[PDB]
Symmetry: D2
Subunit: 329 residues, 4 copies
Amino acid sequence: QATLKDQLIYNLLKTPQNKITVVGVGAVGMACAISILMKDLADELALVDVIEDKLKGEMMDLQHGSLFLRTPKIVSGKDYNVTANSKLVIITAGARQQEGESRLNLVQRNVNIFKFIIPNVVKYSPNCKLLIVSNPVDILTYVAWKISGFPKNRVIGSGCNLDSARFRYLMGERLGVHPLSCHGWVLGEHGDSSVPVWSGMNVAGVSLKTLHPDLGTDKDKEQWKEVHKQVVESAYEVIKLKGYTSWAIGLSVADLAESIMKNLRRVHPVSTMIKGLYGIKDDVFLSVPCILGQNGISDLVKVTLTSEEEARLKKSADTLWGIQKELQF
Amino acid sequence: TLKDQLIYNLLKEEQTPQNKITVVGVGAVGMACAISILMKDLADELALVDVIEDKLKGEMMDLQHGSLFLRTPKIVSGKDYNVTANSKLVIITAGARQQEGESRLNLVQRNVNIFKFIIPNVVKYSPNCKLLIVSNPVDILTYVAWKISGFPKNRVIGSGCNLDSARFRYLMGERLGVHPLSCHGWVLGEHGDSSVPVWSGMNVAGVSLKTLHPDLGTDKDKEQWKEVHKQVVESAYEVIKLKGYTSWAIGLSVADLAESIMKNLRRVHPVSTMIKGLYGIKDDVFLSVPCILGQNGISDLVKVTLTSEEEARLKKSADTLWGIQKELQF
Amino acid sequence: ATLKDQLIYNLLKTPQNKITVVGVGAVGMACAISILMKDLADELALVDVIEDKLKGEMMDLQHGSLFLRTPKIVSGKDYNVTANSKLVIITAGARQQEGESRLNLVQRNVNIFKFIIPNVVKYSPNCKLLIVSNPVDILTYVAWKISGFPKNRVIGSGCNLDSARFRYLMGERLGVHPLSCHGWVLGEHGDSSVPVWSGMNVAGVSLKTLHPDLGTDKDKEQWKEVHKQVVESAYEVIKLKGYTSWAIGLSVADLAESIMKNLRRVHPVSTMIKGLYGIKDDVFLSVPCILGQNGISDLVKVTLTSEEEARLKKSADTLWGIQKELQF
Amino acid sequence: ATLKDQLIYNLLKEEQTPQNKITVVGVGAVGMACAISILMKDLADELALVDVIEDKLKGEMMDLQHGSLFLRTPKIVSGKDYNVTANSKLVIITAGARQQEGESRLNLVQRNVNIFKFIIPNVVKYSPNCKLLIVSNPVDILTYVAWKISGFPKNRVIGSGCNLDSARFRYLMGERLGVHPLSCHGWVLGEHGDSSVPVWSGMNVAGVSLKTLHPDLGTDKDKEQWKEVHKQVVESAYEVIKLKGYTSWAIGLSVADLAESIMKNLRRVHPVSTMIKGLYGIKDDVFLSVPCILGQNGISDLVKVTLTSEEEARLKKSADTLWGIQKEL
Ligand SMILES: Cn1ccnc1C(=O)c1ccc(NC(=O)C[C@H](C(=O)O)c2ccc(C(F)(F)F)cc2)cc1
């Protein structure tokens, strides 16, 4: 007498190597999850949240699509033991930006949540890289770094990877070029104080501000400054229209995860400690271009900013530090 | 202007899109289809259409902001169906969706009404497209789309039991310790409560599970494999109870079908089509049988061998669906 | 200051998904390009003994790095470059000439393996060995005996390709993509391979049940000719272009995908089948195996008809007759 | 009833014209590398191969067909008759004499012009609406020749040009900087050959001009000898050919990169061979590489790269060299 399985299969053999955990199964977390699944970045995906039904429903929905994926193990749970041995833990949990609301208003509430999340993550994946997505992402990357005790190369904020992607899309819409071939960087706060690096914007290595010196100024008859205003307002407008943002940030996060998981050493504008650059003296985290790989941030790229750009980046650091210094944890 | 100093134009002749896909409906199902199609590089232009103008624009913008990470260079939206012109494939997901405990068949009046306005507008602007119906009850709405469009039935395809079969193969794989890709088994009939598990065709590596386990699919089964089908039937209800709706699996299922159509693969999928003439069925009933899918839609039907009980269940599903289809007026 | 140090502030002074391909002949390079375009490795190492071809192939792949997502492509004539591999793919050795049987390669390629396998194993002691060189079933046995690895980690590419060819030919006959044409070729990757007619199906419909004479000498449709074309495929391609490469490279990348991504998909690969069908010796040939990050985790016990089982035992006798004459 | 007829009920009796058909002309090493790269990127729903060596053509076709289970291109065909190429959207020409050890690409010009007099009219006859992608060498001159013979508008006659040279440049840049080539930006323009031009003034990482940081970059006084990078670009093909007998993989991937931009209408910027009359002081009908926007109509636009006087003179010299050959045909 033998069961079906035992008549069909002779068992020979009785840890995951490319495991990714997503913390938070709100819209941002689930868009990160689906993007990472469709890019075949992980051999195991773990989801963690505190709403048990929603967590199970999202896990089941993904699992029902397994035939169409190449990620063979999808698990979930409220207990962080399900996250054990992750290479990469993506934290998207916490309060999310609402209509008309500054991401900076979320800071203390999400700091309080990180006091619980981060130690549990570190307990079960002491060797992982942390990719912070929750907002305000720059301050929460600082907080995650402080709580975790990790070296700062392994604490990465998704930062302005998305703002720069939005900038390159809008740039491409004006020039009739795919964003892949429109190069431009948004640095600083992932938020209202972000900094467009007009002096570096280029197609095929041609500096656009060299052709158009008014680029980025008020006197600009083409009003390129509106491009950056649209970058700043983008999240507010999408939130007002559909209630939240999800797809673009999910793709941005999966882009960062690809560079990390595959050790690509591509350059991304992500949140990291900038103390000692551009005359900044405090432990401020904000986005500068960094080399990203399997050890996290291995190097910073020292971008040459104009005086006007450097002043705006300092203003961004001052805004963040004004909030950072008043946190207790 | 800066653009003219930077760029020398050779020609400004904009041509018709070559691989355009439209998604009608920007609810959770429609957006899951859209992101799945975008990340599989199946379209060179994606159009979104719906009646909720704010949500439509917000979803469009959110996808557009991810363009750097995609290889689909044009993403458009509008309430006017002129944005959908010259689509190769139009995926209809709009309509009411089932609440907790609610049958897909309770959606008929609401979504037939919506289709009576959607389909003529789609056909007006993409007269050569394939219609991929996802809205529920999908088998009845595929019938409806066929009647209203006037298209040949090869170009009217219901997403049908592609998802039920995927779920079945997932649950098979969990029981056997095998990836669903290597677990073969078909759920046919209604995408709903009357679906039919084809026990006689379930296999791994060409080994019939029913041959090894003759009680498979019966009440005397000490392993209770019928509970696997029951889980398939209940899957959407359980997910809806937990997260309020389903989206990711159906989106991946639809992108799977769209891949076969857009790349002319001639893969076999269980999709909603007219099965008149099969198993001595004489009415124009639409339900899922395995179909060869390619760039012209359904090119062939596979004549699955069914046991007596399997065929009786399929006829019961056909009777349930036809009981509803026959009372529809066009 | 150097340009690099002016541009880059450094913060930080082993590969996690490394694949090595041994042999940079046409088969090895087809495996390499297929693996690279499937993004299966974060480091790819090429090893061979022909210094010039090796460096030339390495440089050619590197020059395409902008279009790939594998950031480290290395090569060498020594094993330093292979250290810490998850998967080592062995394609080196003599290949069959026009009209030459794969079994005629035994002496030459067994000799090569007695040098390659002991060294490979020293520097990647945890890798899976994927044998592609021919005769692959005999050489998988050799690699297992020599390496000291447990058998789950010594895998021959086997009949994965014969089955792919069978399903392609099936699909041409039936008007269906090979992905939807299901049928297995087992046994020797060679002239004694066994088509499992009794399992061939589309959408779970048994073709033999529809056509009980399928694949016999009574078959009016002559489906046996489909398997004959499978057996003869490599000979015909070698006669026409001199060698085969693309199909075997894609077949191997398919196996590497299942291993590297821990998919637990079923593939017909060369493994030890002692205990199946009453076979008593350490014969290696292809049966369907579940493939993942530990290599072969399970064997599928295919239900064979009397004639299919008899043909499989004939294949086993041919291989065993050669296997048992080898000394270690 | 036969087995097929017991199993399958045909609804459609015939197949429609292919919608995304690509033809590769020539099945030497370069042609087959293009074919496999295009197949593994899912760019075509039909691939046709043409050449004059009947046995090798059929063997290559069969070998690709035998891997069809692992691909998503359902029709692979071949023939000596160009009717097999009918209705291609893109025809890639790799046929003719290929560069040998020690051999200048320019030595191949007259032989390959002779071959194109037969190939191009046959291609045009069966695919009057295709784009032509010239890979055969010397690619710049043969792009000019294919344009004149075909009668096509120049937007539909594209030379693979310096897309590969630039990829090699960026690879070597990345090796020097420890950055993935995706994040190293730099253009090699002009002849796909010995007279190519490195645009030092445009090289950048994250929009930081390397020449601005390192003003000696590319000159003879350069203590870091970055000019050796371009020398390596120039010599790369010679070295690879000397080592393995030919080049194939990198050009195959480069062509598949161009084919992707064309087939998917991406409007990405690539340095490809086109007419540059009206730029940089060039008044002749010379074809050479400059950055072009590539899409479903082929080359729709050129990017007017800003050059130093020394870069511009080098590009004019490359143009003079090519024109001296072009005009003697
Ligand atoms: C002389 N004669 C007269 C009449 N019949 C005979 C035979 O000898 C004979 C002997 C055997 C068969 N067929 C099978 O063994 C099919 C096999 C099974 O049934 O296990 C099966 C494999 C795979 C699948 C699935 F699910 F994968 F598709 C389903 C079923 C047919 C005729």
